[PDB]
């Protein structure tokens, strides 16, 4: 349907242990394709996807040039920030960055993203209009004011629309097998007593792609979100995904409950009943 490609960069200082550590990973949708690591011995962009291993070495070279360029950018980004906020070098601080782009079912551009976060909170980030910056605190205004005056927002918008998209366009051909497939969940219920007057009802979804999904419990058709347990969606590690939600019920009123699953690989959503 719609599609996405994002690049995620984590850098971390280790004050005693030398240089900061830089980790970056490619993703199309919920499929990962490449990775790069400051501490790896390869020092190249390595493929994480079978359909991306086919690219020429002049592809790999140029990509690993640009990621290496980012890495030192962020290492100096970490120095600037310790300076800006006046934290002591003894502390270990973290700088996360993401950028990428979204396309419609025909493949035209939809949205685009360029953003950084310092110590798990937002530092700077590009607005949806792609003409301005949102800057949380008085530090990021300085970087805003650097990047406004230096015309950064113009140059990234040209990347995001021109480049970011065209690659996602080829990747989705290249990976037609995996990338564009969609997998319905295999679903079922399990029943796990606790006391003699109570039982636990768990509704499962297994082996689905993409990972966006909605699990729902109800009684008599009325919605039960109150007493419901629901776990975070977990990668099955084969490339598919897994999730479950569960409720506690008075025994024996169980068939009075319905579990409702919605996923993009489902022509019509389902209903499970015990």
């Amino acid at each position: 349907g719609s599609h996405s490609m994002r690049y995620f960069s984590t850098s971390v200082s280790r004050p005693g242990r030398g240089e900061p550590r830089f980790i970056a990973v490619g993703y199309v949708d919920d499929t990962q394709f490449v990775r790069f690591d400051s501490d790896a011995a390869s020092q190249r962009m390595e493929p994480r996807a079978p359909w991306i291993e086919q690219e020429g070495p002049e592809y790999w070279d140029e990509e690993t040039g640009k990621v290496k360029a980012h890495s030192q950018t962020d290492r100096e980004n970490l120095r600037i920030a310790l300076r800006y906020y006046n934290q002591s070098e003894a502390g270990s601080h973290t700088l996360q960055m993401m950028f990428g782009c979204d396309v419609g079912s025909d493949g035209r551009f939809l949205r685009g993203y360029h953003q950084y976060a310092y110590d798990g909170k937002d530092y700077i980030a590009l607005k949806e209009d792609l003409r301005s910056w949102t800057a949380a605190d008085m530090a990021a205004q300085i970087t805003k004011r650097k990047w406004e005056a230096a015309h950064v927002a113009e140059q990234q918008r040209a990347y995001l629309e021109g480049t970011c998209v065209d690659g996602l366009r080829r990747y989705l051909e290249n990976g037609k097998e995996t990338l564009q497939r969609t997998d319905p969940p295999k679903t079922h219920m399990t029943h796990h007593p606790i006391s003699d007057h109570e039982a636990t009802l768990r509704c499962w979804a297994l082996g689905f792609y993409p990972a966006e999904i909605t699990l729902t419990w109800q009684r008599d058709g009325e919605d039960q979100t109150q007493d419901t347990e629901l776990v975070e969606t977990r990668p099955a590690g084969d490339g598919t995904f897994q999730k479950w939600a569960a409720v506690v019920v008075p025994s024996g009123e169980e068939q009075r409950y319905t579990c409702h699953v919605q996923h993009e690989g489902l022509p019509k959503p389902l209903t499970l009943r015990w």
């Binding site: 640009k66 980012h70 950018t73 300085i142 970087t143 650097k146 140059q155 990234q156 990347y159 480049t163």
Partner: peptide
């Protein structure tokens, strides 16, 4: 295809 900022912009 990764961001190439030409000449790169730090803070």
């Amino acid at each position: 295809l990764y961001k190439k900022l030409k000449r790169e912009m730090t803070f």
